[PDB]
């Protein structure tokens, strides 16, 4: 699923 990390939304 999409994840959020360091300001960015990307696939996990």
Judged by CB under 5 A, the chain residues 1 through 12 that form the site for Cl ion are 9
Question: What is the distance, to the nearest Å, from the Cα of residue 4 to the centroid of all Cα atoms in its chain?
Answer: 3
Q: Which long-range contacts link 3-11 to residues 24+ away (Cβ below 8 Å)?
A: none
Q: How far is the CB of 8 from Cl ion (least distance, A)?
A: 5
Question: Exactly one of 1, 4, 5, 8 binds Cu ion (CB under 5 A); which one?
Answer: 1
Q: How far is the CB of 11 from Cl ion (least distance, A)?
A: 13
Q: Rounded to an integer, what distance in angstroms lies between the CA atom of residue 8 and that of residue 12?
A: 11
Q: Which residues bind Cu ion (CB under 5 A)?
A: 1, 12
């Amino acid at each position: 699923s999409w994840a959020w990390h360091n300001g960015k939304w990307d696939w996990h």
